[PDB]
Design a protein around this ligand. Sequence first.
Ligand SMILES: *[C@@H]1O[C@H](CO)[C@@H](O[C@@H]2O[C@H](CO)[C@@H](O)[C@H](O)[C@H]2NC(C)=O)[C@H](O)[C@H]1NC(C)=O
Ligand SMILES: *[C@@H]1O[C@H](CO)[C@@H](O[C@@H]2O[C@H](CO)[C@@H](O)[C@H](O)[C@H]2NC(C)=O)[C@H](O)[C@H]1NC(C)=O
Ligand code: TCR
Ligand code: NAG
Ligand code: NAG
Ligand code: NAG
Ligand code: CA
Ligand code: CA
Lengths: 95, 492
Amino acid sequence: VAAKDQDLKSRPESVECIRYNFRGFRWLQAMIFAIEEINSSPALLPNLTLGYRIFDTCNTVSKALEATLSFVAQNKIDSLNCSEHIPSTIAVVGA
Amino acid sequence: GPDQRAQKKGDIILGGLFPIHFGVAAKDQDLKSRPESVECIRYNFRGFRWLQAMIFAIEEINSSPALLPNLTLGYRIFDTCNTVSKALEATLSFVAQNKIDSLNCSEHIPSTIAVVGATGSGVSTAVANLLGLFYIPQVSYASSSRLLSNKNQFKSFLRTIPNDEHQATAMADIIEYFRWNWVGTIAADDDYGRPGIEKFREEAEERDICIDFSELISQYSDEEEIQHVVEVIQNSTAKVIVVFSSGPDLEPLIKEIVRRNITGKIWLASEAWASSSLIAMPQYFHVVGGTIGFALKAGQIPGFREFLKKVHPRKSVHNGFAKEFWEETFNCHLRPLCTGDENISSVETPYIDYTHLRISYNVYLAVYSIAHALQDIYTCLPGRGLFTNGSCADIKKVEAWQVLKHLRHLNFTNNMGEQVTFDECGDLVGNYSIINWHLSPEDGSIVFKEVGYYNVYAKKGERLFINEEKILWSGFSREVPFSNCSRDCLAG
Ligand SMILES: *[C@@H]1O[C@H](CO)[C@@H](O[C@@H]2O[C@H](CO)[C@@H](O)[C@H](O)[C@H]2NC(C)=O)[C@H](O)[C@H]1NC(C)=O
Ligand SMILES: *[C@@H]1O[C@H](CO)[C@@H](O[C@@H]2O[C@H](CO)[C@@H](O)[C@H](O)[C@H]2NC(C)=O)[C@H](O)[C@H]1NC(C)=O
Ligand SMILES: O=C(O)[C@@H]1Cc2c([nH]c3ccccc23)CN1
Ligand SMILES: *[C@@H]1O[C@H](CO)[C@@H](O)[C@H](O)[C@H]1NC(C)=O
Ligand SMILES: *[C@@H]1O[C@H](CO)[C@@H](O)[C@H](O)[C@H]1NC(C)=O
Ligand SMILES: *[C@@H]1O[C@H](CO)[C@@H](O)[C@H](O)[C@H]1NC(C)=O
Ligand SMILES: [Ca+2]
Ligand SMILES: [Ca+2]
């Protein structure tokens, strides 16, 4: 991330990721490739399609925690406490 | 959110995390059925006293016109049970409004402005990640791991308890003072034990001290690991053992050592178990007697004991923890049926039986630090301010990050006449008190006698003072033991 130190004189804003990791992009493409191959292959899990929601971590705990909070939204609503548009995540790959 | 809480509404809401229990049940999850909730078992009267200290501080602030007039503080306090999962449920409860603002329905959701907690360092680490996600200040009273001094990962963490670096240096100084060079080390396999024991290893390497063994223990350790550690201790010829562990995490090992009746070992304790009731009971004085340990500076809270004695399972409606406290204290159920008429003085528990207030004073100071930050928010001249164009934050519409900014620039005065500030790492500096474990001649319990101190404000090599005339090695002997690997070579 961008090491722009915040003095908290204004409302803090989301940090910015700086350098591009091509290897991580290749790993993400590997995940997508595996999912598509599974969907096409009828031998494994027929009549069923696997989806995905993949985020960025930038080797930072905060970004991965925001993504994880997005992952557990429905379970969070069930435990702590509306719309059913929230998709339940069966498993997470990472980090 | 979780139940059994302690809630009271006010204009501004503070969060709280305290160990009302020692730990959760160890029922394994076979996962053949849907996982249920986990149950906490052992009741911690000391953590309940700390919770009462926070509530007492809040009530004292709410009664004083000198601090935050026309504003009422509130509190929403939960139990952690020394477990990350319970604390994370409570923290998810804390940040519901901010979390739903970031990710994305009732407006009644109370917004926590600051959190007080927690005791452990792993628990504080998890809660600190979650709270620093939203810049909610978190002032802890007992977490002392150096890993929490990293501000790149923990943006909003503050402490009223000193760091553990000076304590490891103090242990090295003590070992050097009594001319030992052949020692052993034990630590808890957590974020508190490992950094401290590594710092001690570095200091001992600098002071020409050899270490025979280095073992790691946990409160969930199986039998195999316990016997491995015990055999490691038993084979070693070193009599001095340095322990960085808490009371709950050290109990199985001490029990197993007592079973085999292993004697003659000098125990150097850290602040976590140097005053712990799970290690300091008179059925182990043949093993842990003569323990040399550390303690924090005490504090004076006038009127705290009287408030502690006003606990009642019916009158105290804001504290949902009073019912179980009464049931455990009197062993009744509301087991004889409770009547709500007895005296807390009748039963001897860590709730009222205490001599100094050290962690409780830490909770007191944390609450007052947040209060003084809010006060500085209130008494803010429009010309000069810490935010953009030197403005001032609206006290009626105060946000958590503004409280964080004021806490980063905080300088106030205690009730005892001392200046309270936080450094760049949000840490606070304090003395240390050396104590030794003696046997009580009358009651038969374990007495903590001060035998010296550690002056952190002095220069290196002059910070330690010990009066060995007051020490009783193994509890009875006045002869300093011998803990060198080899006998000194004579002349020629
Ligand atoms: C145990 O070993 C230590 C070595 O660290 C001994 O301490 C040294 O004692 C000599 C004797 O005069 C001093 O000159 C050194 O300065 C000491 N070194 C220290 C204190 O670090 C100690 O005497 C030994 N104890 C016994 C009982 O033999
Ligand atoms: C830590 O302990 C030392 C020693 O007890 C304190 O230093 C003493 O301070 C008092 C006044 O508070 C002086 O009268 C003594 O002469 C000091 N003794 C020394 C310097 O050896 C020190 O103030 C304590 N630190 C605190 C309370 O923060
Ligand atoms: O960081 C930690 O885990 C320890 C826990 C701890 C300390 N002092 C205590 C007294 C009683 C109970 C627990 C503790 C020091 N900080
Ligand atoms: C301690 O010594 C005995 C005797 O040689 C040995 O059997 C045992 O394994 C040793 N313990 C450890 C932990 O090495
Ligand atoms: C433990 O060993 C000590 C040392 O001799 C002895 O005095 C004590 O009676 C022993 N206790 C038990 C229960 O064996
Ligand atoms: C805090 O204020 C006191 C005055 O009460 C002053 O003596 C001290 O130097 C100040 N400390 C800091 C760190 O600003
Ligand atoms: Ca805890
Ligand atoms: Ca205790």
